[PDB]
């Protein structure tokens, strides 16, 4: 009896604390989410089971560190970037698949 | 821990049918072997079977013991009573 | 023949219902059976089929022994697409010689693909001036850039991958084409933790709402 | 009477035991949600400020060149990864449609 | 028909785009490493560009000749 | 003529129905519903297939089924049986496939590789928990416990292997311990067993 009437008597009290705790937190989050509704709209889809945000998304930032002359690579990729030929190619492809949708 | 002692025996059977023989005894007497009870448990299942010959003496004890051993919280008795145990097997699991 | 025609029509309606229930339409089926006893029987089933947007061909030879069954071998052909990971997954399943998980994975991959394409079309329809079709609605990534100021650009890359067991999962990551001019301007420097934060935001409130709020912040 | 007392105390214990778990996980998940949404609000406001500042400065001086560092390199290579595959699929689609 | 002339100019531009691709050895060095090709999605290698850009020509000409351009309700909408 | 064309169409649709049976799942529409047949396989090994009866009327009910009870479906029923039935069927197909694969691995181990096993393996009906002991020939004893708590997959997430009565004396022994740990955590059971035993 004693052990039992000990062990439960705390946990339910803990419950009460947690109860009001979550209640307070709930109120807090309520007003706070109203804040993120100031500019963002109120509103199918299927969320993940917290697996999307686990792998490293910027591993490529390390991979480019392994290439030689990374700054020179940036410079030559920029001097290739300003070429209008590839821009024309891209816009032609865009126009080509524009009618696809 | 129920009162002090009880004659409990286990026997695993096919289709995960653990059969448990329980002979009850009071605080001042050896458990009686002339008034036994039988409980059939299926692993990882929401149902259990009991023969109620003298279980009306202490029903909640067996139920709470079974639910705490099964790691399940709520335990209820549906009003379904029969003698053909195999037909009960078929009807509860819709195995017919 | 009228009763036979009616029965055939009823069976065809049932088959169409099941095809909708699976989302896969098998165009052809050719069956061959041989017996090789010392009772082993080898059955070969050629079939061409298609999912909503994709077409495939496959043949498989299976063995039945007097009371076990196991596929002896299989070959399978896809169509050439950008998603080359689909082809390598097809190859891996071909060594695995597994059919049910393969087909479920293919349907899930097309279901996520259709979702991605529909969301891309919807966002392009919503704002057609700040949304740029880098490779198309059926591509892997999208890019938002300001027409007046081409210095900023934000690309969301979306890739669907297959787990070894056969589980499917999408993945979305950000990257910003940002000049260091704007980085020098404001010293807050919150772009460093942008990917993880955006992933958490998407997990909190989905993809479509996240992109809508993002483009709202670009007003 | 002590045996009955056993019955009610054990019943109360087994009833209250699960009650802790859902409340604990709800508290944890709501706290995590609050922290995440506060962080996300901070980042969205900060990025909106960055966008506004850059737009103002670009309106001040748009003709100046905009250099970029390795942080923006891999995605740009994405538009440099042109191997006609998409255009080949487009040609196949056109060939299918021409019938 | 401006498609003819845009095709002509991109075909003339093919030579110089191949040149500006062969300008550097770093883009050739990142080849063979799948660690970037699985991230970009397919691969980064354009060496048979001659074949593909000369093959699209007959197909585009053929094109210009032929001028090719809940659960209950969802289930009930099928049995009808 | 017309009869020949009708027969050709009938045999074509029958072949298509057989192909549909050979992949994914099966369904045979009846008067009161569909006795949907779910097919199970793993590693190119055909496994036992189950079926469940349906009622097409609005109060969706399962008046008959063959799936074993220890597979949880009533919770999944309250989840997605009324809404998004397609996801319901896909999820139950995944779960039955995982259970069938686990059972196939277990009984394949029991039948074939019992040669080096020193004791019976304790298995649950759902086979989420596995506990066994094995001797490999020098000779080393081990006792392994696998937790298949991720029900949708056929591979365990947490495995623990240890031995009682022998004190650690060879680093190589711990090396095979870790190797077996990785083998269970990554690759199927009988596959790695045949891999190292051979």
CA contacts within 13 A on the Cβ side of D13: 18
For tokens 């009960």, the residue is B88
Chains touching A, CB cut-off 8 Å, 3+ pairs: C, D, E
Q: Token pair for residue C38? A: 């010392």
Phi, psi of D69 (to 5 degrees): -105, -175
Q: Token pair for residue E77? A: 């909408």
Mutation test of the interface with chain E: which of A57, A65, A66, A100, choosing the one with the most E Cβ atoms within 10 A?
A: A66
* C-alpha to C-alpha distances, C108 to C101, C103, E43, F35, nearest whole angstrom: 10, 9, 24, 24
User: Which one of A5, A22, A90 has the shortest CB-CB distance to D23?
Assistant: A22
* C-alpha to C-alpha distances, F50 to D24, F35, F101, F124, nearest whole angstrom: 39, 10, 14, 20
User: Which one of A67, A73, A85 has the shortest CB-CB distance to E17?
Assistant: A85
Counts for chain C of helices (H) and strands (E), in that order: 6, 9
Chains touching F, CB cut-off 8 Å, 3+ pairs: B, C, E
Q: Token pair for residue F47? A: 């496994």
SS3 state of residue C81: coil
| Cβ-based neighbours of F195, under 8 Å, separated by 6 or more | F183, F187
Give F-chain residues touching E71 at CB under 8 angstroms.
Answer: 82-85
- Residues of B near D (Cβ–Cβ under 8 Å) read 2-3, 58, 60-61, 64, 67-68, 73
DSSP 8-state assignment for residue F30: -
Strands, E, within F60-197: which ranges? 122-123, 129-136, 140-147, 158-162
Residue D82 to residue A65, Cβ atoms within 8 A: no
Work out how many CB contacts closer than 8 A connect C with E: 16
CA distance B35 to chain D (A): 20
How far apart CA B30 and CA C195 sit, in angstroms, is 70
Q: Is the dihedral of CA C16, C18, C24, C27 positive or negative?
A: negative
Residue C103 to residue F24, Cβ atoms within 8 A: yes
Work out how many CB contacts closer than 8 A connect B with F: 25
Residue A85 to residue E39, Cβ atoms within 8 A: no
E24-43 residues touching A, CB cutoff 8 A = 24, 26-27, 29-30, 35-36, 39
CA distance E38 to chain C (A): 8
- 3-state SS, C161-173, equals EECCCCCEEEEEE
Write down the experimental method used for this entry: cryo-EM
D3-22 residues touching B, CB cutoff 8 A = 3, 6-7, 10-11, 14-15, 17-18
Q: Which residue of F has its CA nearest to C69?
A: F46
How far apart CA F194 and CA A86 sit, in angstroms, is 55
Q: Token pair for residue A81? A: 């970037």
Q: Token pair for residue B12? A: 């695993």
Residue F29 to residue C98, Cβ atoms within 8 A: no
Give C-chain residues touching D47 at CB under 8 angstroms.
Answer: 190-191, 194, 217
DSSP string, A19-68: HHHHHHHHHHHHHHHHHTTTTS--------SS-TTTS-TTHHHHHGGGSS
CA distance A91 to chain C (A): 9
**Residues belonging to chain D:** 99
Alpha helices for chain B (secondary structure H): 59-69, 85-93
* C-alpha to C-alpha distances, C83 to A90, C89, C97, D85, nearest whole angstrom: 19, 10, 21, 10
User: Which one of F62, F64, F124 has the shortest CB-CB distance to B44?
Assistant: F124
How far apart CA D95 and CA B58 sit, in angstroms, is 81
How far apart CA F88 and CA F93 sit, in angstroms, is 9
Which residues partner with C121 through β-bridges? Answer: none
Give C-chain residues touching F2 at CB under 8 angstroms.
Answer: 1
């Amino acid at each position: 009896i004693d052990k039992m009437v000990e062990t439960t008597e705390l946990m339910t009290g803990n419950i009460q604390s947690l109860k009001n705790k979550i209640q307070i937190l709930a109120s807090e989050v309520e007003e706070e989410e109203e804040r993120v509704k100031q500019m963002h709209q109120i509103n199918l889809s299927l969320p993940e089971l917290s697996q999307k945000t686990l792998k490293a998304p910027t591993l490529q930032k390390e991979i480019l560190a392994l290439i030689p002359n990374q700054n020179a690579l940036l410079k030559d990729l920029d001097i290739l970037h300003n070429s209008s030929q590839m821009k024309s190619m891209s816009t032609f492809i865009e126009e080509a698949y524009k009618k696809l949708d | 821990r129920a009162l002090k002692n009880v004659t409990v025996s286990f026997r695993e059977t096919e289709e995960n049918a653990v059969w448990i023989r329980i002979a009850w005894g009071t605080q001042y007497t050896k458990p009686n072997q002339y008034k036994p009870t039988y409980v059939v448990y299926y692993s990882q299942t929401p149902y259990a079977f009991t023969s109620s010959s003298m279980l009306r003496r202490n029903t909640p004890l067996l139920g709470q013991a079974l639910t705490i051993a099964s790691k399940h919280h709520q335990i209820v008795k549906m009003d379904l009573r029969s003698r053909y145990l195999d037909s009960l097997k078929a009807i509860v699991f819709k195995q017919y | 023949s009228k009763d036979l025609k009616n029965q055939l029509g009823h069976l065809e309606s049932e088959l169409s219902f099941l095809s909708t229930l699976t989302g896969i339409n098998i165009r052809n089926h050719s069956k061959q059976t041989e017996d090789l006893t010392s009772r082993k029987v080898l059955q070969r089933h050629r079939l061409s089929g298609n999912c909503h947007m994709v077409t495939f061909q496959l043949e498989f030879q299976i063995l039945e022994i007097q009371l076990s069954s196991a596929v002896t071998d299989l070959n399978i052909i896809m169509e050439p697409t950008e998603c080359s990971e689909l082809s390598e997954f097809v190859s891996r399943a071909e060594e695995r010689k597994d059919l049910f998980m393969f087909f479920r994975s293919l349907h899930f991959f097309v279901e996520w693909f259709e979702y991605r394409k529909r969301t891309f079309k919807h966002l392009k329809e919503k704002y057609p001036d700040a949304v740029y079709l880098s490779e198309g609605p059926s591509s892997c990534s999208m890019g938002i850039r300001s027409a007046s100021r081409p210095g900023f650009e934000l690309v969301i890359v979306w890739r669907i991958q297959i787990d070894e067991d056969g589980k499917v999962f999408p993945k979305l990551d950000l990257l910003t084409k940002v000049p260091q001019r704007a980085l020098e301007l404001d010293k807050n420097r919150a772009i460093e933790t942008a990917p993880l934060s955006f992933r958490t935001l998407v997990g909190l409130l989905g993809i479509e709402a996240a992109l809508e709020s993002l483009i709202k912040s670009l007003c | 009477k002590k045996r009955q007392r056993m019955i009610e105390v054990q019943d109360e214990l087994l009833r209250l035991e699960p009650q802790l778990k859902q409340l604990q996980t709800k508290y944890d998940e709501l706290k995590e949600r609050k922290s995440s949404l506060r962080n996300a609000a901070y980042f969205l406001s900060n990025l909106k400020q960055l966008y506004q500042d850059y737009s103002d400065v670009q309106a001040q001086e748009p003709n100046v060149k905009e250099t970029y560092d390795s942080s923006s390199l891999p995605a740009l290579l994405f538009k440099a990864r042109t191997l006609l595959g998409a255009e080949s699929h487009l040609r196949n689609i056109n060939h299918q449609l021409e019938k | 028909d401006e498609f003819m002339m845009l095709l002509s100019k991109v075909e003339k531009l093919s030579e110089e785009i191949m040149e500006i691709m062969q300008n550097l050895s770093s883009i050739q060095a990142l080849e063979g490493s799948r660690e970037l090709e699985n991230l970009i999605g397919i691969s980064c290698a354009s060496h048979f560009l001659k074949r593909e850009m000369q093959k699209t020509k007959e197909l585009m000409t053929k094109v210009n000749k032929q001028k090719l351009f809940d659960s209950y309700e969802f289930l009930k909408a099928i049995l009808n | 003529n017309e009869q020949e064309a009708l027969e050709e169409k009938l045999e074509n649709v029958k072949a298509i129905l057989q192909a549909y049976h050979f992949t994914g799942l099966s369904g045979k529409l009846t008067s009161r519903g569909v006795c949907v047949c779910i097919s199970t396989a793993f590693e190119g090994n055909l496994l036992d297939s189950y079926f469940v009866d349906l009622v097409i009327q609005k109060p969706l009910r399962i008046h008959h089924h063959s799936v074993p009870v220890f597979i949880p479906l009533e919770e999944i029923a309250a989840k997605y049986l009324q809404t998004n039935i397609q996801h319901f069927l896909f999820s139950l197909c995944e779960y039955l496939n995982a259970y069938s694969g686990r059972k196939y691995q277990a009984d394949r181990l029991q039948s074939d590789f019992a040669a080096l096993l020193t004791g019976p393996l304790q298995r649950n009906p759902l086979c989420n928990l596995l506990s066994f002991t094995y001797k490999l020939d020098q000779s080393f004893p081990f006792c392994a416990r696998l937790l298949y708590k991720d029900l949708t997959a056929t591979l365990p997430t947490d495995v623990t292997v240890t031995c009682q009565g022998v004190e650690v004396l060879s680093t190589s022994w711990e090396e095979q311990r870790a190797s077996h740990e990785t083998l269970f955590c990554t690759k199927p059971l009988h596959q790695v067993f045949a891999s190292f035993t051979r």
